[model samples]
Target: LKARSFDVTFDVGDEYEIIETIGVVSSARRRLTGQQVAIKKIPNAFDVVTNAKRTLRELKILKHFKHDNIIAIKDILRPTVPYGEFKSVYVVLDLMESDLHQIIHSTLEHVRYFLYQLLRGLKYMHSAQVIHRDLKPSNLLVNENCELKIGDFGMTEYVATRWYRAPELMLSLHEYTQAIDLWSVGCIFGEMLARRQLFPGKNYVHQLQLIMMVLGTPSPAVIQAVGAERVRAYIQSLPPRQPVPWETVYPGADRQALSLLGRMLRFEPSARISAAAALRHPFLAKYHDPDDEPDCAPPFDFAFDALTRERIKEAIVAEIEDFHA
Candidate 1:
């Protein structure tokens, strides 16, 4: 809906346009010349102080880190406004053709490939002192070539999200570290293969219910910090300890991958796999080839036209614009 100019040139073909609104808080657009580029513009009014601080934090983190699977920040745009108002900050990023959410829904094999890429990204982030606090299908982007990049560091604090949030955040035990991110990775892995969240709970209590239903209720001695009355009630309501083994969800999945998933989703954050350690896991060895082509590619060609290409372009641009404005 808004037309603005970029200092840098882009040759986005007639078939493609910039995506503006990604969700509620971020705006992004992709333009291509020698290589495709995504420009993410941060809105001044949306969350002035928080967004500004995050923008700087993300830049600081991205600057020192380098990894093939992790999306690289190409440039930053700081458009000047009058002194008092917050200036619009445009963060230029590497644009991908789609996200794992799109690709996995397109084909089953892509799911495996996507998980492989996720592990690689996590591996690199952990090494760089970066914790991708937000690891989800939507946050991971994939190109037509099947190249996957982790994007959207905005929600990715040096901390964690509430739901994919680890027990450490709940217990307030220690400084949030790389292990919390692995829990999010495990949740995303579960969603990718099973096509649903492994644990979809409504609140903290509900989340614990899902966890206990699968992992078993913690003995009162183990959860000594929880008050006696509620703890006693919780223990009474606990389901019989029936493990929701990963293989049961995806019989076709590689056992090694399932094992990797288990280590990441451990109830105890201390025992969870560190992001760097996850990359070294045996499961990831199969899909370690950065140059390996995707097994089952998505059909992005719109000649047959179930969904019009123009609509996709409009959707992308609108998403990016909405993010900032």
Candidate 2:
């Protein structure tokens, strides 16, 4: 196979003034449009290629996305030195003032609108091999218009957070699927309605205990689908438990949102409500327009797990260099 070739030159910068020092990301406004963007300066990005792998992972996935509700990568700031030793990188992303971790009181419409948007972007992302690992409310970025964008590559051993982690991640060790995202969405949905985390586990074991407590023990079918001997045995060891009915948990929340949430929080991964299906639920019917939803024809490729730190570094650098043209 032959590849097309093109010459390139990356424009390094001094175009925007940094606005803050206390930052995981500092705010900067672009010159011409004067549009604001968040600049995240990641250091030692190639440190053993661990952070490098994650930084590149996020970079590629964001670049692949084109949905309005998903965060967009405005650009990858140019490199000052092409790299005698490149260890740090800066990423430019659309600035979102706050995230769901700090949000809403629409009573009901806010819930639907937010869910509609989350699933909307998810329809695009779900059509991916990339399994979203972390989806806590903090990762769901929000703005003045109250719009929400799913953030974070869903990674980094960032164990400081796990409230939104799905049961399958905790109970089963097999590779998780995009179905995992729906569970996180369900957790995110419940928190929106409850004003607190639905399953706030202190540790991994407690996490699954919380899951069984909320969902009751897995259905026989779900246990069968768990696909791991010890995990299924673990289910057998637990006492029979009845699921907490949705109405009982939320008291007077919308029946429709509860129904959708119930469908997603299932222990059977494949049985969980899918992104496209959730979008179609009556909860979002008023806003769901079949023609409006977009899909990624061919999905995202590669597993960073297989990439050497050097290859990971190359992928990240190439991603930045491509923006120059």
lDDT of 1 by residue, 160-231 (tens): 235566756664534466788778777777776666777766755577677666556555344544343565
Best-fitting candidate, scored by TM-score: 2
Error of 2 at 240 (Å): 2.2
Candidate models: Cα lDDT each = 0.57, 0.73
Worst 10 residues of 1 by lDDT: 293-302
TM-score of model 1 vs. true structure: 0.67
In every candidate, how many clashes are there?
18, 1
- Cα displacement (Å) at residue 75, model 1: 2.8
Candidate 2 per-residue lDDT, tens place, 1-325, comes to: 1111111122226565544432557777776676888877775677774676777777888888877878878877755656777766767888888888767322567878888888887888777655567777777888868777888776635456577777668655455667888888898888778877777677767778877777888656766566678887888888878886788878758788879888988776666778888888999877777776788778887656546758777777777778775
Global Cα lDDT for candidate 2: 0.73
